Design an enzyme around this catalytic site. Structure first.
Site, PDB file in Angstrom:
ATOM      1  CG  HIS A  61      -1.854  -1.346   1.069  1.00  8.34           C
ATOM      2  ND1 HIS A  61      -1.794  -2.479   2.835  1.00  8.34           N
ATOM      3  CD2 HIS A  61      -2.778  -2.068   0.493  1.00  8.34           C
ATOM      4  CE1 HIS A  61      -1.755  -3.362   2.187  1.00  8.34           C
ATOM      5  NE2 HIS A  61      -2.733  -2.996   1.186  1.00  8.34           N
ATOM      6  CG  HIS A  91       2.880   5.745   5.020  1.00 11.19           C
ATOM      7  ND1 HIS A  91       2.242   5.158   6.476  1.00 11.19           N
ATOM      8  CD2 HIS A  91       1.934   6.260   5.114  1.00 11.19           C
ATOM      9  CE1 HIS A  91       1.241   5.916   7.487  1.00 11.19           C
ATOM     10  NE2 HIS A  91       1.298   6.361   5.713  1.00 11.19           N
ATOM     11  CG  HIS A  93      -0.780   7.577   1.382  1.00 16.04           C
ATOM     12  ND1 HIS A  93      -1.583   7.807   1.250  1.00 16.04           N
ATOM     13  CD2 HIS A  93      -0.404   8.179   2.787  1.00 16.04           C
ATOM     14  CE1 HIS A  93      -1.531   7.020   2.735  1.00 16.04           C
ATOM     15  NE2 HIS A  93      -1.420   7.086   3.696  1.00 16.04           N
ATOM     16  CD  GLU A 103      -3.816   9.699   2.366  1.00 15.14           C
ATOM     17  OE1 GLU A 103      -3.674   9.321   3.225  1.00 15.14           O
ATOM     18  OE2 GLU A 103      -4.570   8.690   1.873  1.00 15.14           O
ATOM     19  CG  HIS A 116      -0.016   9.859   6.585  1.00 12.30           C
ATOM     20  ND1 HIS A 116      -0.599   9.499   5.911  1.00 12.30           N
ATOM     21  CD2 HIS A 116       0.438  11.548   6.284  1.00 12.30           C
ATOM     22  CE1 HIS A 116      -1.576  10.169   5.433  1.00 12.30           C
ATOM     23  NE2 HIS A 116      -0.877  11.750   5.588  1.00 12.30           N
ATOM     24  CB  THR A 196      -5.997   7.739   5.261  1.00 12.49           C
ATOM     25  OG1 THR A 196      -4.890   7.442   5.114  1.00 12.49           O
ATOM     26  CG2 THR A 196      -5.644   9.759   6.376  1.00 12.49           C
TER      27      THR A 196
HETATM   28  N1  LIG Z   1      -2.525   6.487   6.056  1.00 14.16           N
HETATM   29  S1  LIG Z   1      -2.348   5.987   7.755  1.00 14.16           S
HETATM   30  O1  LIG Z   1      -1.248   7.068   8.823  1.00 14.16           O
HETATM   31  O2  LIG Z   1      -4.335   6.293   8.563  1.00 14.16           O
HETATM   32  C1  LIG Z   1      -1.494   4.284   7.610  1.00 14.16           C
HETATM   33  C2  LIG Z   1      -1.935   3.925   5.826  1.00 14.16           C
HETATM   34  F1  LIG Z   1      -1.377   4.814   5.091  1.00 14.16           F
HETATM   35  C3  LIG Z   1      -0.894   2.789   5.326  1.00 14.16           C
HETATM   36  F2  LIG Z   1      -0.012   2.634   4.362  1.00 14.16           F
HETATM   37  C4  LIG Z   1      -0.695   1.364   6.795  1.00 14.16           C
HETATM   38  S2  LIG Z   1      -0.249   0.025   6.489  1.00 14.16           S
HETATM   39  O3  LIG Z   1      -1.490  -1.034   6.751  1.00 14.16           O
HETATM   40  O4  LIG Z   1      -0.774  -0.625   4.875  1.00 14.16           O
HETATM   41  C5  LIG Z   1       1.847  -1.100   6.547  1.00 14.16           C
HETATM   42  C6  LIG Z   1       1.619  -2.444   7.212  1.00 14.16           C
HETATM   43  O5  LIG Z   1       2.719  -3.298   7.626  1.00 14.16           O
HETATM   44  C7  LIG Z   1      -0.916   1.974   8.029  1.00 14.16           C
HETATM   45  N2  LIG Z   1      -0.865   0.848   9.272  1.00 14.16           N
HETATM   46  C8  LIG Z   1      -2.938   0.612   9.144  1.00 14.16           C
HETATM   47  C9  LIG Z   1      -3.400   0.430  11.093  1.00 14.16           C
HETATM   48  C10 LIG Z   1      -2.485   0.599  11.849  1.00 14.16           C
HETATM   49  C11 LIG Z   1      -2.711   0.551  12.976  1.00 14.16           C
HETATM   50  C12 LIG Z   1      -4.019  -1.525  13.107  1.00 14.16           C
HETATM   51  C13 LIG Z   1      -3.636  -1.817  11.951  1.00 14.16           C
HETATM   52  C14 LIG Z   1      -3.549  -1.233  11.452  1.00 14.16           C
HETATM   53  C15 LIG Z   1      -1.816   3.062   8.209  1.00 14.16           C
HETATM   54  F3  LIG Z   1      -1.854   3.645   9.938  1.00 14.16           F
HETATM   55 ZN   LIG Z   2      -1.124   7.399   5.833  1.00 14.04          ZN
END
Ligand SMILES: NS(=O)(=O)c1c(F)c(F)c(S(=O)(=O)CCO)c(NCc2ccccc2)c1F
Ligand SMILES: [Zn+2]
Length: 258
Positions: A61, A91, A93, A103, A116, A196
């Site tokens: 992702h 990470h 976007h 975003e 982020h 997100t």
């Molecule tokens: N934009 S965000 O900060 O809300 C975000 C992401 F963009 C993202 F790509 C991820 S990820 O899950 O795809 C990377 C996987 O290792 C998470 N993590 C989501 C998450 C957070 C807490 C508990 C469970 C899943 C994630 F939280």
């Molecule tokens: Zn994010």
């Protein structure tokens, strides 16, 4: 098997994660005339340790840089936050076009991309997973990227992307100057919101910096050649991974500055 493709993208996430239609979903459009200046907001204060970074991987992702988070060596405090938020991962976007990848949007305008930096309330909760389930559990710092002079820490990231092309691949990643992916001005907007991506949990105090940093077009293009598919699956490219702005539902976005 959510994603950003036609058949599994953001408009479909609600079929599997009903909180996609919740009261406090992210990202949002920041409308600066409805924004409230707030003198109780503290400046951000950021401890950070470049040896905290441990690896980078392709989640399918985005890429993620994960960091050791057993100590309070890299933390975010101040701002709207009470207590100390421990750094967990970073990470990015982007979109398929250099001019529409962020975003959050600001008064109708999208940026090329959006970084982020995700933290969790270790003063109250035992783990990142458990904080992600509480309204005060997570703090995410959002930094816009615009096309301009290449950032050397973004270069440190892009140099790894061939080694993590397929979903699930990873590689050692440390001595990461994250503070240098922040702009010189730490003015910010803040509102309560959510992850997100699925599970879309409404556990996030969003802190979005006004000032963008710079990425080159070549650097940004390299992210689009990551796959959202694993080794020996039929290849699909992660050309875009941003969620559209979600209804504000009357939430108040505050500014640190006026
Ligand atoms: N934009 S965000 O900060 O809300 C975000 C992401 F963009 C993202 F790509 C991820 S990820 O899950 O795809 C990377 C996987 O290792 C998470 N993590 C989501 C998450 C957070 C807490 C508990 C469970 C899943 C994630 F939280
Ligand atoms: Zn994010």
């Amino acid at each position: 098997s959510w994603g950003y493709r036609e058949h599994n993208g953001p408009i479909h996430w609600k079929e599997f994660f009903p909180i996609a239609d919740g009261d406090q979903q992210s990202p949002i459009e920041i409308k600066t005339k409805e924004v409230k200046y707030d003198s109780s907001l503290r400046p951000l204060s950021i401890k950070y340790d470049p040896s905290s970074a441990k690896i980078i991987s392709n989640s399918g992702h985005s890429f993620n840089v994960d960091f050791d988070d057993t100590e309070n060596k890299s933390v975010l405090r101040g701002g709207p936050l009470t207590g100390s938020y421990r750094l967990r991962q970073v990470h990015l976007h982007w979109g398929s076009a250099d001019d529409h990848g962020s975003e959050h949007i600001v008064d109708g305008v999208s940026y090329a991309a959006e970084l982020h930096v995700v933290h969790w309330n270790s003063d109250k909760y035992p783990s990142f997973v458990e904080a992600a389930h509480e309204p005060d559990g997570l703090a995410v710092l959002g930094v816009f990227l615009q096309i301009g002079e290449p950032n050397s820490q973004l270069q440190k990231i892009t140099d790894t992307l061939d080694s993590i092309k397929e979903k699930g691949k990873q590689t050692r990643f440390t001595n990461f100057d994250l503070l240098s992916l922040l702009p010189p001005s730490w003015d910010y907007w803040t509102y309560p919101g959510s992850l997100t991506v699925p599970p879309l949990l409404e556990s996030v105090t969003w802190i979005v910096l006004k000032q963008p940093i710079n990425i080159s077009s070549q650097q940004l293009a390299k992210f689009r050649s990551l796959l959202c598919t694993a080794e020996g699956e039929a290849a699909a490219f992660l050309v875009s991974n941003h969620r559209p702005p979600q209804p504000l539902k009357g939430r108040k976005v505050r500014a640190s500055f006026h």
